[PDB]
Amino acid sequence: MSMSTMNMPMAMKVGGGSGSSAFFFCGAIFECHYLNGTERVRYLQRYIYNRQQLVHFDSDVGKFVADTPLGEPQAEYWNSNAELLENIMNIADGSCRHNYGILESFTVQRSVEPKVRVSALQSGSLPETDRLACYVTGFYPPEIEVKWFLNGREETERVVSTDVMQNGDWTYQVLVVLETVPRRGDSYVCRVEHASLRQPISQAWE
Amino acid sequence: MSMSTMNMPMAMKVGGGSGSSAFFFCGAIFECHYLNGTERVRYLQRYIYNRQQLVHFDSDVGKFVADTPLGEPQAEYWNSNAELLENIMNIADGSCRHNYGILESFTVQRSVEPKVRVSALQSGSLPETDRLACYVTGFYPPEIEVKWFLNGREETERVVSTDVMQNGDWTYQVLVVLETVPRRGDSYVCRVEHASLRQPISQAWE
Amino acid sequence: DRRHVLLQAEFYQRSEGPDKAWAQFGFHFDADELFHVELDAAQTVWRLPEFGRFASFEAQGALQNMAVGKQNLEVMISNSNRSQQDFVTPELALFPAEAVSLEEPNVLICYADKFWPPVATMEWRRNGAVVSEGVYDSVYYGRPDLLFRKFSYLPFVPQRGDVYSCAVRHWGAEGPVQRMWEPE
Amino acid sequence: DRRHVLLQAEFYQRSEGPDKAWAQFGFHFDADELFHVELDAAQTVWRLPEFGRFASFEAQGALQNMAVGKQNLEVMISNSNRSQQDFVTPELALFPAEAVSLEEPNVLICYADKFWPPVATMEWRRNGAVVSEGVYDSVYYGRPDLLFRKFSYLPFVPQRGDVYSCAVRHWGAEGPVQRMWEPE
Numbered sequence: 095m096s097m098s099t100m101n102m103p104m105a106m107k108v109g110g111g112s113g114s115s116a117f118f119f120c121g122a123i124f125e126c127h128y129l130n131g132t133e134r135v136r137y138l139q140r141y142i143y144n145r146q147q148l149v150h151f152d153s154d155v156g157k158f159v160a161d162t163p164l165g166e167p168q169a170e171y172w173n174s175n176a177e178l179l180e181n182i183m184n185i186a187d188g189s190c191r192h193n194y195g196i197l198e199s200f201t202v203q204r205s206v207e208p209k210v211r212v213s214a215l216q217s218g219s220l221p222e223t224d225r226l227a228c229y230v231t232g233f234y235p236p237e238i239e240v241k242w243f244l245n246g247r248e249e250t251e252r253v254v255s256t257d258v259m260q261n262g263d264w265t266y267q268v269l270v271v272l273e274t275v276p277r278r279g280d281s282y283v284c285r286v287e288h289a290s291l292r293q294p295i296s297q298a299w300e
Numbered sequence: 301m302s303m304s305t306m307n308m309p310m311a312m313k314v315g316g317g318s319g320s321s322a323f324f325f326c327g328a329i330f331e332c333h334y335l336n337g338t339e340r341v342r343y344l345q346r347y348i349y350n351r352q353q354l355v356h357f358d359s360d361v362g363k364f365v366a367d368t369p370l371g372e373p374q375a376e377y378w379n380s381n382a383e384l385l386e387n388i389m390n391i392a393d394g395s396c397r398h399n400y401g402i403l404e405s406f407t408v409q410r411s412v413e414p415k416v417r418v419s420a421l422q423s424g425s426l427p428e429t430d431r432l433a434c435y436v437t438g439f440y441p442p443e444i445e446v447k448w449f450l451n452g453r454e455e456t457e458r459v460v461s462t463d464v465m466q467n468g469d470w471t472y473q474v475l476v477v478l479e480t481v482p483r484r485g486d487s488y489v490c491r492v493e494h495a496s497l498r499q500p501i502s503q504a505w506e
Numbered sequence: 507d508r509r510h511v512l513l514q515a516e517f518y519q520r521s522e523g524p525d526k527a528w529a530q531f532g533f534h535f536d537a538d539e540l541f542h543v544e545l546d547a548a549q550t551v552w553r554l555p556e557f558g559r560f561a562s563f564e565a566q567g568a569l570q571n572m573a574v575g576k577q578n579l580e581v582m583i584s585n586s587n588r589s590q591q592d593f594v595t596p597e598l599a600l601f602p603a604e605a606v607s608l609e610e611p612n613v614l615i616c617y618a619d620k621f622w623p624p625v626a627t628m629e630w631r632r633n634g635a636v637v638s639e640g641v642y643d644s645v646y647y648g649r650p651d652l653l654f655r656k657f658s659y660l661p662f663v664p665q666r667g668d669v670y671s672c673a674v675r676h677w678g679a680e681g682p683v684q685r686m687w688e689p690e
Numbered sequence: 691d692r693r694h695v696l697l698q699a700e701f702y703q704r705s706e707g708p709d710k711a712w713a714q715f716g717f718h719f720d721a722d723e724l725f726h727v728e729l730d731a732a733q734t735v736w737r738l739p740e741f742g743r744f745a746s747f748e749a750q751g752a753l754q755n756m757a758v759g760k761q762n763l764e765v766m767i768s769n770s771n772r773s774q775q776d777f778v779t780p781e782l783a784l785f786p787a788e789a790v791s792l793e794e795p796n797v798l799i800c801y802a803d804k805f806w807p808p809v810a811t812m813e814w815r816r817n818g819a820v821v822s823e824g825v826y827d828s829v830y831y832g833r834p835d836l837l838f839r840k841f842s843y844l845p846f847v848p849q850r851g852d853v854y855s856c857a858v859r860h861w862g863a864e865g866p867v868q869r870m871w872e873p874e
């Protein structure tokens with residue numbers, strides 16, 4: 095189905111007023127916060143000039159609130175218009191819930207499996223130390239658990255994890271490195287749990 | 301006291317043999333591995349041409365071993381010289397133990413306290429998430445434990461730690477970030493344990 | 507872990523000396539882009555073309571928001587007495603999409619983050635020479651702190667000894683920010 | 691956690707077209723430098739001058755090792771029939787020593803890692819202009835994988851809007867590797 099615009103076009107009132115190079119920026123952001131799917135939704139409007147939020151609207155409050163003096167005329171102006179405020183409360187319930195129904199199956203429920211590569215390098219300094227890398231790529235959603243196991247037991251110390259990194263194409267990646275001194279007979283296993291997997295992936299080193 | 305050189309000058313034998321730009325590199329590395337202070341010491345020599353180890357010497361074996369064909373003449377040549385090998389075994393016991401005695405008090409026993417700064421930023425994307433940073437600087441030795449506590453309980457999930465980073469001036473630094481949704485009344489504390497501290501440092505957020 | 511945000515984000519901006527105007531209208535879900543409208547062509551462009559099989563968006567709403575947003579920009583310029591803010595320089599990350607193996611195809615990602623205003627072009631080089639085959643540039647993604655971010659993608663097949671660079675020219679800047687990357 | 695390594699590391703290298711020779715002799719403990727010998731001046735130079743209150747090293751031993759190491763270099767050049775290897779490009783990290791606060795003094799560290807051969811100069815810029823006041827450059831530190839690393843230090847007092855860069859020119863390279871850093 096067709097998604098709905100999450101605002102109605104709203105005009106600001108001119109009212110203070112008035113070397114060569116110059117830059118001017120105007121942003122508007124309309125957010126549906128789904129705190130528990132559509133059982134609890136908070137709708138926000140934000141108006142920005144340059145790097146400052148002038149005024150916002152919270153569906154939980156139901157009126158505009160000026161954050162800086164540049165927004166005080168606009169808040170007072172819009173707040174006196176019952177049609178503006180009624181239109182906005184209709185969007186805040188209708189549009190957020192309508193858009194969620196369309197998006198749910200391919201966003202909230204998007205599921206792309208991680209690929210796992212284990213490899214090892216000697217560290218850049220003595221004493222002799224191995225860096226066991228668990229490289230996890232291509233997954234959605236970004237929430238993932240990536241843990242190192244030594245002889246069936248979870249390793250805590252000397253585990254360094256990068257943040258889950260955004261690829262920008264609806265996939266994510268992460269790198270978890272265990273610094274260790276291997277002994278003969280030692281069994282090192284990277285274990286990856288993710289909503290997209292029926293069972294965890296276990297990839298052992300060499 | 302005066303430290304001793306950890307080799308004696310040893311000459312290689314010429315023996316195959318023979319566009320414009322060129323680069324040639326020759327390295328020699330002499331290592332005392334203190335596995336349990338001076339109770340167990342392994343002395344190594346390594347000879348390198350460009351990016352290849354030609355030949356090495358292990359005090360535990362007591363003879364040169366060629367790793368590539370370019371080292372086979374040199375290993376065989378040096379191995380037939382009992383004076384070379386006896387001189388080298390004298391260094392491998394005397395020099396490693398002598399140098400350790402001089403260095404111990406300001407290297408093995410060097411102790412510089414960490415400085416701890418806690419700060420917070422909102423993440424770069426909604427839903428609203430706080431990144432609590434525990435920034436730890438100026439410490440030696442590099443081994444350190446940096447953990448986040450929520451309401452007296454250790455946080456495991458959504459903790460990302462950089463590697464302990466070398467400053468190159470005999471001090472180290474590390475950054476441990478906890479991604480969290482704060483609730484009112486929540487108490488977040490960064491706890492830092494280090495050989496240089498009589499008691500752990502506990503720095504709370506705001 | 508269960509909250510989600512859908513954002514409709516729009517911006518209208520202009521420079522004097524030199525004179526230039528820009529506009530963007532997009533929907534975003536958590537950190538990712540659903541679509542943006544090509545405002546010239548009244549065309550919805552989905553970030554992954556498969557999203558277009560499940561939903562549609564009429565660009566009419568974006569054309570209306572553009573008109574009013576450009577007028578609101580002039581109102582805020584006059585009410586503020588032309589107040590301006592310091593530019594914030596891009597921070598670059600440069601990483602491959604996948605585990606690198608020599609002579610296997612992959613994608614290098616140049617991520618420009620925490621900059622303002624949202625005007626920045628990426629230039630890719632390989633061994634000092636400009637490369638542009640199959641490059642994709644993202645639109646500008648906002649942050650809660652009112653700074654912006656952008657992605658560029660370079661398809662590559664790595665050879666030993668390759669050196670890749672991404673250079674970001676931010677509006678008004680005397681020179682680009684740059685990062686290099688080498689396979690292995 | 692209780693192992694330690696003391697290394698005596700030396701290298702002798704030369705280029706043709708252009709013709710240049712270099713030499714280094716140092717002691718290293720774990721990842722850090724104890725000292726190197728200034729071979730011209732037969733002078734031991736401790737990484738932290740306080741180390742000189744606890745120990746001494748006679749540079750005579752280094753002068754002898756230099757002589758034999760330069761001769762062994764010619765032997766390996768002839769026995770290998772002048773065999774050569776590919777250069778490996780530096781990877782840069784650029785980070786402050788301490789937590790940054792605007793207008794408080796600090797040190798920016800440029801760390802060049804995983805390169806070969808050990809010939810690389812750092813150039814610092816602030817807002818595109820070369821800066822060199824109080825800069826310290828380290829000697830080359832080896833790695834088990836036979837690549838090298840080096841540190842450069844720039845004392846700085848940060849102002850909002852400052853952009854710092856470190857550029858590394860590796861021997862023979864058609865251009866430098868570069869990284870930028872901004873406060874806050």
Ligand SMILES: CC(=O)N[C@@H]1[C@@H](O)[C@H](O)[C@@H](CO)O[C@H]1O
Nearest residue numbers: 129130131132133134194198202
């Ligand atoms: C899969 C999913 O989205 N489930 C939510 C659920 O949390 C909530 O109970 C319901 C309200 O009836 O709204 C749904 O959208």
Ligand SMILES: CC(=O)N[C@@H]1[C@@H](O)[C@H](O)[C@@H](CO)O[C@H]1O
Nearest residue numbers: 335336337338339340400404408
């Ligand atoms: C503080 C220290 O270095 N202690 C070690 C110790 O592990 C070992 O028992 C001893 C041999 O007797 O060698 C010392 O150097």
Ligand SMILES: *[C@@H]1O[C@H](CO)[C@@H](O)[C@H](O)[C@H]1NC(C)=O
Nearest residue numbers: 128129130131132133134508
């Ligand atoms: C979310 O919504 C459902 C009703 O659909 C409700 O019963 C459930 O307990 C809610 N969960 C929370 C944690 O508020």
Ligand SMILES: *[C@@H]1O[C@H](CO)[C@@H](O)[C@H](O)[C@H]1NC(C)=O
Nearest residue numbers: 334335336337338339340692
């Ligand atoms: C290290 O050395 C001491 C003797 O000085 C010895 O008794 C001790 O048990 C050794 N430790 C190990 C773990 O080998």
Ligand code: NI
Nearest residue numbers: 191192193195
């Ligand atoms: Ni509907």
Ligand code: NI
Nearest residue numbers: 397398399401
């Ligand atoms: Ni002695």
Ligand SMILES: [Zn+2]
Nearest residue numbers: 127427428509
């Ligand atoms: Zn929210």
Ligand SMILES: [Zn+2]
Nearest residue numbers: 129130133134
């Ligand atoms: Zn509820």
Ligand SMILES: [Zn+2]
Nearest residue numbers: 150152155159
């Ligand atoms: Zn509010």
Ligand SMILES: [Zn+2]
Nearest residue numbers: 257258259479
């Ligand atoms: Zn994260």
Ligand SMILES: [Zn+2]
Nearest residue numbers: 290291292293
């Ligand atoms: Zn599966």
Ligand SMILES: [Zn+2]
Nearest residue numbers: 221222333693
């Ligand atoms: Zn060892």
Ligand SMILES: [Zn+2]
Nearest residue numbers: 335336339340
């Ligand atoms: Zn023993």
Ligand SMILES: [Zn+2]
Nearest residue numbers: 356358361365
């Ligand atoms: Zn051996």
Ligand SMILES: [Zn+2]
Nearest residue numbers: 273463464465
């Ligand atoms: Zn480490």
Ligand SMILES: [Zn+2]
Nearest residue numbers: 496497498499
């Ligand atoms: Zn103390």
